[PDB]
Amino acid sequence: DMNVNFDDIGGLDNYIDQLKEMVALPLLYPELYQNFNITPPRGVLFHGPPGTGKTLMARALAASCSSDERKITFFMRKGADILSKWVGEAERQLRLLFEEAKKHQPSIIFFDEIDGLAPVRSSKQEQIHASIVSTLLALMDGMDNRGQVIVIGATNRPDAVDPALRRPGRFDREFYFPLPDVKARFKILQIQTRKWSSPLSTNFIDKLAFLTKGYGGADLRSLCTEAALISIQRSFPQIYRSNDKLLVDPSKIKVKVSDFMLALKKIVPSSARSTGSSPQPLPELIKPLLADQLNNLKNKLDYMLNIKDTTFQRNTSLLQNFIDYEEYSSFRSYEFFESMAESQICKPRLLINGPKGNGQQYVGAAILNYLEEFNVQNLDLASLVSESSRTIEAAVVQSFMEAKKRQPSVVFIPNLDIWINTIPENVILVLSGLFRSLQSNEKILLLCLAENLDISEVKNGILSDFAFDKNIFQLHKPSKENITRYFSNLIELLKTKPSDIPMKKRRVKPLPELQKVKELILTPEQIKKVSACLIEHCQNFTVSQLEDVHSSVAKIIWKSKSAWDKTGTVDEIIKFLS
Amino acid sequence: VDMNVNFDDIGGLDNYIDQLKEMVALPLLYPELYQNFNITPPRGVLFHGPPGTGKTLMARALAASCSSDERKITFFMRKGADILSKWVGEAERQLRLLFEEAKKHQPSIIFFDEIDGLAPVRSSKQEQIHASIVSTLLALMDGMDNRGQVIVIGATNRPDAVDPALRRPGRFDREFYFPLPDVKARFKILQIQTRKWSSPLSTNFIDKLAFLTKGYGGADLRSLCTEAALISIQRSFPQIYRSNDKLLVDPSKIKVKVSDFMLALKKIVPSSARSTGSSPQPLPELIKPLLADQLNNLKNKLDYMLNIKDTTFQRNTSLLQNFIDYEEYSSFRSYEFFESMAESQICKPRLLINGPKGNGQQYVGAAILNYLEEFNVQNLDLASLVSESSRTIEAAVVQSFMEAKKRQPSVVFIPNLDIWINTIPENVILVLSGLFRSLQSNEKILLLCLAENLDISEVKNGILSDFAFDKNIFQLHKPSKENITRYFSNLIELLKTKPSDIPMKKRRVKPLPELQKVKELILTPEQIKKVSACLIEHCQNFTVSQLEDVHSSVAKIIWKSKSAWDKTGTVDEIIKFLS
Ligand SMILES: Nc1ncnc2c1ncn2[C@@H]1O[C@H](COP(=O)(O)OP(=O)(O)O)[C@@H](O)[C@H]1O
Ligand SMILES: Nc1ncnc2c1ncn2[C@@H]1O[C@H](COP(=O)(O)OP(=O)(O)O)[C@@H](O)[C@H]1O
Description:
This is part of a larger assembly, with 2 copies of chain A. Chain A is of the alpha/beta class. In chain A, 43% of the residues lie in helices and 10% in strands. The first copy, chain A, is built from 22 helices and 11 strands. In chain A, the strands form 2 sheets. In chain A, strands 2-3-4-1-5 form a 5-stranded parallel β-sheet, sandwiched between helices. In chain A, helix 3 (89-103) runs parallel beside helix 5, helix 10 (287-303) crosses helix 19 (480-494) and helix 21 runs antiparallel to helix 22 (567-576). The structure holds adenosine-5'-diphosphate (ADP) (2 copies). One adenosine-5'-diphosphate is lined by residues 10-13, 51-57, 181, 189, 192, 218-219, 222 of chain B. Chain B: Residues 45-173 are annotated as: AAA-ATPase.
C-alpha cells in the first residue's frame, strides 16, 4: 500500500472514470437516482492477464479516496484467507467482515483471487467452499437498499468464478484489463521513468514501446528496474566485491541506451514464459528483402479489417469523448449508420503463398506483431498436438471458440502445406463448418501462410470451403534492388575500420578503489567487384539462400576484423562465389 | 539443515551469485541507490535445473553469506507441499502465518524446495485442493500491501509444472537455470570437496578427475569423493568392519590414492547414465586411432557452423566480471549493426553424419556431444520419446523442441535416423520440419542426425527434404590402413609384455595386526611382424565393429597365456585364427 494516485496508471482511463463514478456520484450527487428508479451498480469484477493493473486499480482507489473532505476505508481479504479448519468459523469471519463494512459506510471490500475463494458450482466437494460461496451470495445480495458496499473482485480466469456470483445484482460490471498497446506502453514507460535524475529521449521511449510487444505493466517495470540495476553494475562494480559498505555517489549513475538494450535480452514477458517467445517485428538485416512487400500486405490488412480508422472508440476515454466532442433522428438513423459502419467487413481471409524458404516465418510474425488489438489463436501443429489428452478436434474447436469470445481475433495457421497433411480431413472440415457458421460482420481473420501451395487445392480442393478466392497474396522472390541493399549492408562491414569495430579492450589501469565509509586499403574497384559477384551469384534466389550467402561472406569478413590489407578478404569472397 | 556453507562452497555459479547479491545484500547496505530511481529490488527467484546441481546449496549459502554482518536474515524453509492437511483449513492458514512471520522479521528468505508439488498446473479434475493454495500464494506474494523484504526462492526440476501466474514479475521475476557443470566448475567442485583433507591431492590429478567425470553433477562429485574416502578407510583399516567394539585407529596414513578414486568411479553411476539418451563422453582410448582422424574434421566443420572458436560477442559468462576487467568503447551504428552482423553468421546449422552399418556412429555422436559442452542436448531418439508412457510421440517431440527453443545454444539429437524415419509416424517428421522452418535463421538450434547406410534419395526428394541437408552431409568412411596399424599396435604392445608386468594382486604372507580396543620373454621380432601383417591383411575394408570383433577375439587369445613366457603358441593360435 503506497500513495499511488490515479496518475500512476496508464492506459485504463475508462475504468478509472467508471470507478470514480461509482465511488463518488452515489454519495456526492445522490438525487439523480430517484427520478429513475434505479440502484447504483454494486459489484465489479476485474479480470485479465497477469501484470495489468488490477491490484494497482484497487490500491489507487484506496489511496485517492482517502483525503480531508471525505473518508473511504478499504477492507481487503485475499484468496481463501478467511477459512480455517473450524467448521463455520469462516462463515462467522465473513459475516463479521460485512458487519464492520456495514456499520461503517466508508467501506469498500476487495476480494483478490476470487477464483480460489469462490469457485464454480460444486458437483463433488460439498464441503466448506460451497458454504462460503452460498454465504457470500446471501451476504452480498442485500442488507442495504442503496448502500455503500462496493465489492471489487480480482481474478485471472473469470470463467472459474461461480456463475451465481456473476449476475446483475452481485458483481454487476465485469471489466477486462487488456495487455497494453503501443500508446499505453509509452505512457507506462513514462510513468516508470519519471522521477529519474536524467530523463530519456522520447524517440527512445517510442522505440522501447515498439520493441516490447506482449509486455504487461509489471514487465515494463521489471525492464526499467533491470536497466537501472545494469547501470549500477556498470558505474560502480566495486560494491559487488565488498562485504562492508563503500562510498559511492549518485548522479554519475545515468541509464544509457545500452543498459536498456541489454535488459531487453534477459527479460521475457509473462505472456511468453510458457510459450518461449512472442511475435517479433521484421529483423533489421532482412528488412531490405521483405519490407518492400510486407507494406502491401499491411495495406490489404488495413483495407479488409478497418484498422487505421477505428471508428468506434478511437480516443482515450468515453467521458472525454463527451467533453471534447459534441453529439450529432436517432431511432432509424443510428441503426442505419451502425449497420453501415459494421458492414465494412465481409469475410477477412488471407493466404500468403510463396516459394520454399521465402521468409514466411518473418512475414507471419511481422503481421502478428502489427495486429496489436487482436487475440491470436495459433492453429499450428506445436499448439494442437502439444497436449496428450485433448484431440486435434477438441483443440481446434476450443481455439476457435476462444477466437469467437474475444471478437477481434486472428486464427493463425502457419505452414498450411504441412497442416493439410498432418491434420486429417475431419478436423479441416470441422474448422470449415465453424467458419461458415459465422456472421459476415464477425472480426475473425483467418490468416494462413504456405510454401509452394498449389492453387488447385484452394480453388477445388480441401481448402476450397474457406473462401480463399481473391485473397491470395503472393510472396515473390526479392528483386535486384533489395539484394543490392542487403549486400551493401554486408559490404559496409568490410569497409569499417579495425579501430571502429566494438571490440571491447581490457582496461590498462585497474578500477579506482572507493572510501570505505592508419587507414585501411580498399580500392573501390574491389568493392564494385564484390558487389557484382554478390549480385550475379544470387540470381533468382529466395530469402533463405540469400541469408546463406550472407552468413558465408560475413564469416570471411569477421575473420579479418583486425586486418588492414583487405585484399585477401576480397579475393576469398571472389573465390567463395564461384 | 542450515549450516555454515557460504559462497566459497559453491563452484561454477559465479554469475548468479552476483545477481543474488544484487537483490538480497546490496539493498540492505545501499538503500539510497535503489530509492534514487524509485525501483524496488527484484524479489523472488525460481531455481531450476537437473537434479544434483546446487539449488538448495545456493539458497542456504545466500541465507548464511549475506548474514555475516549484524544484519540477520532468517531462513524459513518449506518442503514441497508438506503444508496441507486432510481438512480444508491449515493449508492456506499456515502459508498466512509463514508470510506474516516473514513480514515480522523483515530481512527474510522463504525457500520453497520442490515448489512443483505445492503449486501445480490447473488440470481437468481435482481442482480444489491445489487451486485454493495457489490462490492464497499468489495473493500473498504480490498483494496490495507491501510484503516487505521477503525474498521468495523456489526450486524445481522443471519449471513448467509450476503455475504460470507464479512465473510473473513481483513473485518469480528471475528464473535461474542451474547447469550441469563444465570441466572448470567440476575442477572447482572437486577442489572444494577435497579441501579439508589432511593429505591433499595434486592439481593434475584433480584435472584428470575433472576430465573423467563428464556428466557428473555436484552431488555426484560429492558422492564420488565420499566413496573414495570410504574405500581409503576400507583399504587402510579393514579390521574396524569386523569387530563390534571401537578399535583404536589413527587418522594419519589414510591418504586417498588414485586407486580409490578409480574404484569410486565404478561404484558411482551418474545422472547422465540414468537418462535414456546418448550420454556425452569422449572417444575411448582403444578406438581413438580408428576415428579421431575423421572426428576432428567434423569438429572443424562444426567450428565453421556454430562459431565456437570465434567468440567475441555473446561471451556472457559473468556480466559483472565483464564490467570489471573490460572497458566501454553512433549508438545504433556501433551496437545494433555489429550485433546483427555477429548473429548473422549462424544461418541454419544442420549436420547429417552417414556411414556404413557399424562404423562407430555411437562413439562419434557421443564425442560430438562431448565437444559441444556449452550446448543443451535434447535427445529425439526413440527411447526418450516412448519412455514417458503418458505422453504421445508428437507431444514429446514438441516438448523437446520447445525446451530446445529456450536456452538457445542447443542440439536436437536424432541418433539412428535410419530407424527413426522407418518407425516414427510420418506426421511427426512433418511436425518437426514445421517446427524447424518456423525458426529464425540466427537461432543456434543445431540438428544433428546420425544414420547407418541412409540413402541420399531420402534426403534429396524424400521425407527429410524439408530439413535442408544439402551441403551438410558428412560421410564417415571406413578406417584406413594406418589407423588399423595403430589399433593392432596397441594390441601387439599388450602381447609383448612380461608376466611380472601383468598386474596380479598379492597373497599376503602375514595377517593384519589386531587393534587395541578402547625367466626371460622369448618372442622374436619376426613373429610380431607376421602377426601384424596377418591382422592388417585380414581386416581389409572392415568397419569399426568388425575391427572390434577381431580385436576382442585376439585379446582373448593373448589373455589366455598371460603367464606363459614362451609366446610362440599364442602367436601360432593368433595366425591360426585369422585364416
Ligand atoms: N497500467 C499500469 N500502469 C502503470 N504501472 C502498472 C500498470 N499495471 C501494472 N503496473 C505496475 O505493476 C505493478 C502492479 O501490477 P499488479 O498489481 O501485479 O497487477 P496484477 O495484480 O493484475 O498482476 C505496479 O508496481 C505497477 O508499477
Ligand atoms: N555448484 C556446486 N558447487 C559446489 N558444490 C555443489 C554444487 N552443486 C552441488 N554441490 C554439492 O552437492 C550437494 C547436494 O546438492 P543439492 O542441494 O542436493 O542440489 P539439488 O537440490 O539441486 O539436487 C551439496 O551439499 C553440495 O555440496
